[PDB]
Amino acid sequence: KAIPKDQRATTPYMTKYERARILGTRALQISMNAPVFVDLEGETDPLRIAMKELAEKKIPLVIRRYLPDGSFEDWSVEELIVDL
Amino acid sequence: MDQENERNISRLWRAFRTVKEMVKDRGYFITQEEVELPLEDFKAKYCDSMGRPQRKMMSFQANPTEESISKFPDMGSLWVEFCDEPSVGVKTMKTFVIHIQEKNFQTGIFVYQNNITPSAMKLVPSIPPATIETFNEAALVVNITHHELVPKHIRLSSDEKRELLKRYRLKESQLPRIQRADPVALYLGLKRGEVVKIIRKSETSGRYASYRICM
């Protein structure tokens, strides 16, 4: 039921799961001829590209982490600290 | 030569200590000294000239501590009762069920010997809001809460209780449970709907605190 960008108690870090699904969804779009936001310095494999987009923080996605009570927090991929 | 009666006095004495300690943990003013009443002083201060103990005079009253009242305001006084009759009867309990109700005692603890008549047992729930508790001496000869495996149980105030549910954002049904007739809940006179913070040692972290709501 929405939670202000402030008062977020959830981890600043990306979960292995979040990352896995983000790399999976994004790779699906790349494989379907969807535009890429990172300079393709050779890479051709969609996932390999998706990963490059994650590092350079150019994936316009948002994770809606729901809490067991129904409420939820909204974190942007860009915002999430990636270290797994 | 004092045969059975000898080691029979020691049991009434020990159980008396458990009742003192129990009342103290509930939040009533009691001297550590009184709790550690040596056996010999007991045999004197509570026994007649024959070797037999007079339970009638062991009974006492307990008052909430200043500290206890700061959290639980509705905590009135307490009355403990040691019945001289082995098997309590309806006529015997009635006198008790009235004593409490009369002196406006909020809680009445009835400590009996062997057992009580099922007839008399159905005389407890009959003087709201004052509640009456029963304890078999045998079950008090030892304080269970003094056992390694038994961690610290702390009755929470309705305040803390609200605070608890608010932060973890939980329904009452989502909290771990503890049976009403659970030995420890019986010890702390827990009432349905009440929450207890359980502070236990952990080999994983230092301490770990869990919660249980009395069913």
From Swiss-Prot, chain A:
Which residue stretches belong to region Leucine-zipper? 40-61
User: Where does the UniProt entry say this protein principally localizes?
Assistant: cytoplasm
* Any one GO cellular component localisation term in the record: RNA polymerase II, core complex
UniProt keywords (A-Z) are: Cytoplasm, DNA-directed RNA polymerase, Nucleus, Phosphoprotein, Ribosome biogenesis, Transcription
Q: Which domain of life is it from?
A: Eukaryota
Question: What Gene Ontology terms describe what this protein does at the molecular function level?
Answer: DNA binding; DNA-directed RNA polymerase activity
Q: Give the subcellular location.
A: Cytoplasm; Nucleus
Query: Which GO terms of type biological process are on file?
Result: nucleolar large rRNA transcription by RNA polymerase I; ribosome biogenesis; RNA-templated transcription; termination of RNA polymerase I transcription; termination of RNA polymerase III transcription; transcription by RNA polymerase I; transcription by RNA polymerase II; transcription by RNA polymerase III
Extra info from the record? Present with 6090 molecules/cell in log phase SD medium.
**Free-text function comment from the UniProt entry:** DNA-dependent RNA polymerases catalyze the transcription of DNA into RNA using the four ribonucleoside triphosphates as substrates. Common component of RNA polymerases I, II and III which synthesize ribosomal RNA precursors, mRNA precursors and many functional non-coding RNAs, and small RNAs, such as 5S rRNA and tRNAs, respectively. Pol II is the central component of the basal RNA polymerase II transcription machinery. RNA polymerases are composed of mobile elements that move relative to each other.
Q: How does it assemble?
A: Component of the RNA polymerase I (Pol I), RNA polymerase II (Pol II) and RNA polymerase III (Pol III) complexes. Component of the RNA polymerase I (Pol I) complex consisting of 14 subunits: RPA135, RPA190, RPC40, RPA14, RPB5, RPO26, RPA43, RPB8, RPA12, RPB10, RPC19, RPC10, RPA49 and RPA34. The complex is composed of a horseshoe-shaped core containing ten subunits (RPA135, RPA190, RPB5, RPO26, RPB8, RPB10, RPC10, RPA12, RPC19 and RPC40) where RPA135 and RPA190 form the DNA-binding cleft.
- Family membership: Belongs to the archaeal Rpo6/eukaryotic RPB6 RNA polymerase subunit family.
* Name this protein carries in UniProt: DNA-directed RNA polymerases I, II, and III subunit RPABC2
What high-level taxonomic lineage is stated for the organism?
Eukaryota, Fungi, Dikarya, Ascomycota, Saccharomycotina
Swiss-Prot record, chain B:
GO:BP terms for this protein? nucleolar large rRNA transcription by RNA polymerase I; ribosome biogenesis; RNA-templated transcription; termination of RNA polymerase I transcription; termination of RNA polymerase III transcription; transcription by RNA polymerase I; transcription by RNA polymerase II; transcription by RNA polymerase III
The alphabetical list of record keywords is: DNA-binding, DNA-directed RNA polymerase, Nucleus, Ribosome biogenesis, Transcription
The protein's job, in short, is: DNA-dependent RNA polymerases catalyze the transcription of DNA into RNA using the four ribonucleoside triphosphates as substrates. Common component of RNA polymerases I, II and III which synthesize ribosomal RNA precursors, mRNA precursors and many functional non-coding RNAs, and small RNAs, such as 5S rRNA and tRNAs, respectively. Pol II is the central component of the basal RNA polymerase II transcription machinery. RNA polymerase complexes are composed of mobile elements that move relative to each other.
Subunit structure and binding partners: Component of the RNA polymerase I (Pol I), RNA polymerase II (Pol II) and RNA polymerase III (Pol III) complexes. Component of the RNA polymerase I (Pol I) complex consisting of 14 subunits: RPA135, RPA190, RPC40, RPA14, RPB5, RPO26, RPA43, RPB8, RPA12, RPB10, RPC19, RPC10, RPA49 and RPA34. The complex is composed of a horseshoe-shaped core containing ten subunits (RPA135, RPA190, RPB5, RPO26, RPB8, RPB10, RPC10, RPA12, RPC19 and RPC40) where RPA135 and RPA190 form the DNA-binding cleft.
Under the heading Gene3D superfamilies, the entry gives: RNA polymerase, Rpb5, N-terminal domain, RPB5-like RNA polymerase subunit
Which InterPro entries does the protein's record reference?
Answer: Arch_Rpo5/euc_Rpb5, RNA_pol_Rpb5_N, RNA_pol_Rpb5_N_sf, RNA_pol_subH/Rpb5_C, RNA_pol_subH/Rpb5_CS, RPB5-like_sf
List the record's Gene Ontology CC terms alphabetically.
Answer: nucleoplasm; nucleus; RNA polymerase I complex; RNA polymerase II, core complex; RNA polymerase III complex
Name of the molecule in the record? DNA-directed RNA polymerases I, II, and III subunit RPABC1
Give the organism the record lists: Saccharomyces cerevisiae (strain ATCC 204508 / S288c)
Q: Where in the cell is it found?
A: Nucleus
Q: State the family named in the UniProt similarity comment for this chain.
A: Belongs to the archaeal Rpo5/eukaryotic RPB5 RNA polymerase subunit family.
- State one molecular function term (GO): DNA binding
Annotated gene: RPB5
